[model samples]
Target: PEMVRGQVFDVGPRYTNLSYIGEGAYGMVCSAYDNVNKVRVAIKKISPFEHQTYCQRTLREIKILLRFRHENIIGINDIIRAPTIEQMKDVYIVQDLMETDLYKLLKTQHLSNDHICYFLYQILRGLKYIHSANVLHRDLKPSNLLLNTTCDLKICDFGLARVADPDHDHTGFLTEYVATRWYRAPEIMLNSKGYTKSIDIWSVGCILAEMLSNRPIFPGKHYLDQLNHILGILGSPSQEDLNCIINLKARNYLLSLPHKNKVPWNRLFPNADSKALDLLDKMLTFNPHKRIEVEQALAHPYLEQYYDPSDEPIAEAPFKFDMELDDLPKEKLKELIFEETARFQPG
Candidate 1:
């Protein structure tokens, strides 16, 4: 009998499609069974035929996935591409199939303190690894967090991630707007020229709050509204914090807003334990420098019991995409992707 093909594209004979899972910004995702490996997998069909920008982002994501290997980071099982350059249209990225994402899980179920701790623990673990590698997960919302029935979480979506190099000037390299508005750090919202890995820490704080409240901590309608929502809870940034806002427009905007006192942490999460609140406070600080680093966050009292230094994965060298993908021509992009596939192919 002939093998069944997926609704999107044929990965290979080694993988059989089960069902369409969902769609993302770049492509469609489907659940499949790996015949050779004898396990289920999620295949992301990244079609770069439509636009050069899409192709570029897809290449960057592929590069990052190939280099980073951690328990909490999404695993790239295999890469399936067209056999010939003339037929190249899409690339199939086979990864571990996740039961659900944190976004859907939070909507359907209420997470207990244990659930929150464990979930946050895994997030921090993955983040610690990513940050240590000097990569920023520019987009770190709940939906990007892949979860399974076992409560394991892996960070996904690296199309926007850039190298977090302190010395390398990012004024020309980084985008002014990257992360989703709701989980976006204030610095990013203010259009800070140069940001760091701590931007992701701010996002994790937002996720932690959302898990506890079963709703977004700051569900703003737009960028301006986002800053307002953050201020309403965290209050106005002091002169010290304001000084950190290098963007003249962002600085002027903050100065124009009426002063607002911060709402106490206890009031925000009345049911949460003191330890949990403490960690949240540290993570949610207005100043990026003041925000808890991933390593410190993992060692926080709230997650102390879950912390085992021995279990922490050693950080790999930072994954660097030296070439700017967006500037590359279609044929060049295709060549680069094909090269990547060949490099990672099973021996």
Candidate 2:
């Protein structure tokens, strides 16, 4: 309400007055001039105490992002804290500003197969580096992907992300609740084996399909309906396939459903390139174990021109996190965030 800003933010003399840009469930975003950097930066002021889950997400995002920096992943310029520890009610993130996101782009622009393939390559390359650290983006959707008008794309928002515990053999045993429903993997819905990197592969397939058709591949109204739409298209898995579901009720739910026949990919996208469809088929496999991995997708003919072994990099070390993220008290989260921001500030 003041200075054309919400007047709720004061990011210090390093940044100029804010011009509010957008609002998120956990924070409000604005664009301002970074006097020191002499460039435009987007800053999100996230209130961290309330909705403790959001605090944990913000903590994870700041920590993971600081280490996972890559050309195709959103870069963090800085993290600003409230001037004094006593007043530190919010955490501010300063990062590159993008014109829009893939969700918004898909609605307005018409893209050719080349355009689609290039975007897919970027996503996979970024993911290759990410999964290399034994991290699963758990949430990969169109909106979480930022795009520049020049076709540059970067993966963003790691709030729902989790790093795999190597002790568990590069798999996480946490609940399978992640990603928007439309892009969710079938294994997640069935609460199958601990979520694997294949979860992100399934989402990439859904995103590719949406780009081809300009509509959600599976617009499930609710969780049950969502699984139904997926089953309808993927068809019923074999008894062997059904065994992948470890949960009794989840497994029996499939047994009770009317059987279905797998639909042809070409029929779904008559105009799609065969190569694209082939990759999508492998990516959208009904069984997680049978699904494509990031490296395999990069090696596919559809993305051959863009794949380079030298260019793809794996993380030097596994992305690790505290096991009690969800269990930390607000004060502990506040302290953690404060310490993180200190890395970028004058000590």
Candidate 3:
């Protein structure tokens, strides 16, 4: 009964032990068998009741998972709902279990051109849907992308994701602390004064570059270190690009730094597909304004073989974040989680 100890990871008889997945800031994640459904699933355990912000974060991901159902986006198949707020110390989210994430897969696998193209196709396909919902997946990295043997992908970890408010005036605000410093868009690195769907596109470019070269494009520990890697390859952006950056404080750092000339794309990614290189060039554009959008990227030559307008779908409407719900007390959020749990339960 320990598995049903009525505490964290108490997923009941429906889900039985298969193997422990892994743990990180998102808490523990593992694979299990769904006895009732007769399928494998990934269970993520997070104790949100311990912190106010944690509760909100958990609620956001749950809500998004519920509302934004798509083939390439992670969705919740089940949730272990507690009967009372006091008993709701932890939450277990059930999702499709992927073989491994792109990060781990990249460590040992040498991707073929077709594999790279198709993988990126799905990434862009999913991004098209996510952007249609007006959600920016602020935390996109190789690790955040779940992969399968068939090359199917699921974009997970929406804790840092955001819904762009159409009526809100100050949508520019962002925390540079969110994205993996290595794959972060240049705009997100220094000037958080604003963000765009293109920032997400930049992340795809970094991921693509890694696939082509079998290593991270800008593997840096610090923001400046990342910026240096970028500048060294892409070189300093034109003053026009600098002008596009909102905060002068952010632009000042670039102006003061030593200038470097642009490195040819061929030089960086040798023996790479020219079309893929071209696509990466557009995604990593210094000016976010000039960067490719999700739809455009999907239609590029690199992914031409997989391009099917019928396959790409958009959300009927933008997923709205209830501003009021975000500030609700912990008890209220706990109740909300309980409410969502019912949807995943038997009728």
Candidate 4:
């Protein structure tokens, strides 16, 4: 497939440097003032060494992003590539800059039960769309979810995504490194050869739990340990899951392991409504086949009550194109500083 390359632009006055946003394996992300659009954008600068990978993934991500522009999905602004190898000499993926990720926000216990439901439902919606489009978000974790100023979320990162023909059976082998440990599905943990959209559903369940408890529902230190951790909470696999488990790894552990299938859902979320717990239980079911589908999940009373049946319009978040060197008002600046301080800044 011919990949879409980012637009090459001269190091002119098109974009103004605002502030540093983040750094990653590929390169750094910064807040840039877009003079043309009269708005601020998050620019991801790629290192020369990673140009090929960066270009390919960026193009694929853009294609995927454009295909599904739901309220819960992230918006791609402009893809800018610097012309001169002398000036920065990097390509930039311009996107809407968000305040922080859900993972970072979880550190302060600022999310309420209702807020968690709102966020999780949106995630499920996004995943449902991707899966519907025959794509899978292999890395559906908290960090890949960005939060706009309104506290709404947009799914980011398609570097690890894959497209499968749902009309036909998939025979490809799966990697154990697909999703984050806490959110990976049981099939993935077992290194199942042929995985499906069910993997993302499993992550949905994990994220729902994380949002509610403000702690990892399955805090396994090691990969194998994650199985024990999940079984400890949700109990062992059922007869059907055990069959698939044996077919994948020929293990009797899933069948023989003592698992308590019945746990009081209320205890997990004392403050949450029963409807929310009901959906969570379904999503967290041991059998992916029995797990709630996107449509079914959206129909759940918990989600229905919070969201309007007709409201699917993408939210237009408040973001300025340019700001004075100190344009960040006192309150906004404080919020940003506080969020930065509360991040992976550990003792």
Better of 3 and 4 by lDDT: 3
What overall lDDT goes with each candidate model? 0.82, 0.82, 0.80, 0.64
Task: Say which prediction, candidate 1 or candidate 4, comes out ahead on TM-score.
Answer: 1
Model 3 spans with C-alpha error above 4 angstroms = 2-8, 165-176, 324-331, 345-347
Backbone clash pairs for candidate 3 read 21-30
Task: Provide C-alpha RMSD values for all models, in order.
Answer: 2.7, 2.6, 2.7, 12.6
Instruction: Mark the 10 consecutive residues where model 2 has the least summed lDDT.
Output: 166-175
Root-mean-square deviation of Cα positions for candidate 2 versus the true structure, in angstroms? 2.6
User: Where's the lowest-lDDT run of ten residues in candidate 3?
Assistant: 166-175
Candidate maximizing lDDT: 2
Candidate 2 collision pairs: none
Ranking by TM-score: 2, 1, 3, 4
Q: Write the per-residue lDDT of candidate 3 for residues 160-194, one digit (tens) a residue.
A: 77785424322232334656788777666665522
Q: Which lDDT tens digits does candidate 4 get at residues 264-288?
A: 6797778776877888888887666
